[PDB]
Design a protein around this ligand. Structure first.
Ligand code: YNF
Ligand code: ZN
Length: 258
């Protein structure tokens, strides 16, 4: 009876195995755009992904993830609200069964069809397992997806999903450029938060871009064809793999823009 996203094992149940689920800096949150404070001392985000080395794509049973070589500074996030250098580990998505849901963060209670998370770890901690134990260990760049025109840079990901349909399947996935998933603007909101999946560790500086990317209805349909189950098990479509907004508590969301 491991955690997941169903009625019997979904977000309302996670606190029993992961008590931090009810902690003081949980994610995601609703971004109330009128309450976020413009902070003129926030720096522009520096996304340096020119030397990114993608390695593999994996269906982990909760999402799918594209993994990168993070054994040297090849794909790094710096600047913005961060101190020092964060290496890209992997990206993955959360999505819904319908286009009016699927994002984890919300903006003035608006849900997007999906959310992309680019997960990075602070190099000062040496490895991601150590970074998970630190309040400034991770930084996640979150990007909303709306349905409209296709995102050309997402198509190589979509096209290989059939080969990783079920839990535990992986494929080689080299030469993928994550720059092709970014919107034009790097304007963002930021707040201190957590993983949105177990173990829900409170180690994340969230950087959520204000501009969504557009994907097509056919791209998100391919996400919804993936399975939570492993091969040869009863089919359970991987949809609605999102945690809903958690209490902001004693936190301020800061905007990089006016
Ligand atoms: C048990 C893993 C289930 C799937 N979760 C993730 O892949 C994941 C999601 C987020 S999120 N939705 O906040 O961006 C983040 Cl920040 C880190 C990780 S992978 C991380 C898990 C703990 C061990 C180190 C890698
Ligand atoms: Zn995520």
């Amino acid at each position: 009876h491991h955690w997941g996203y169903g009625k019997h094992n979904g977000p309302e149940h996670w606190h029993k195995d992961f008590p931090i689920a009810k902690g003081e800096r949980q994610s995601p949150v609703d971004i109330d755009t009128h309450t976020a404070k413009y902070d003129p001392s926030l720096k522009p985000l520096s996304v340096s992904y020119d030397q990114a080395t993608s390695l593999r794509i994996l269906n982990n049973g909760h999402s799918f993830q594209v993994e990168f070589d993070d054994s040297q500074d090849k794909a790094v996030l710096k600047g913005g609200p961060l101190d020092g250098t964060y290496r890209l580990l992997q990206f993955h998505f959360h999505w819904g069964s319908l286009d009016g849901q699927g994002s984890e963060h919300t903006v003035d209670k608006k849900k997007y069809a999906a959310e992309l998370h680019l997960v990075h770890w602070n190099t000062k901690y040496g490895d991601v397992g150590k970074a998970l134990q630190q309040p400034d260990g991770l930084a996640v760049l979150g990007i909303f997806l709306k349905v409209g025109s296709a995102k050309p840079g997402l198509q190589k990901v979509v096209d290989v999903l059939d080969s990783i349909k079920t839990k535990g399947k992986s494929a080689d996935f080299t030469n993928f450029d994550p720059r092709g998933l970014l919107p034009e603007s790097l304007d963002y909101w930021t707040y201190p938060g957590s993983l949105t999946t177990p173990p829900l560790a409170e180690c994340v500086t969230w950087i959520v871009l204000k501009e969504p990317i557009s994907v097509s209805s056919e791209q998100v349909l391919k996400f919804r064809k993936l399975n939570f189950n492993g091969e040869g098990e009863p089919e359970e479509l991987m949809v609605d793999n999102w945690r809903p907004a958690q209490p902001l508590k004693n936190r301020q969301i800061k905007a990089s823009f006016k």
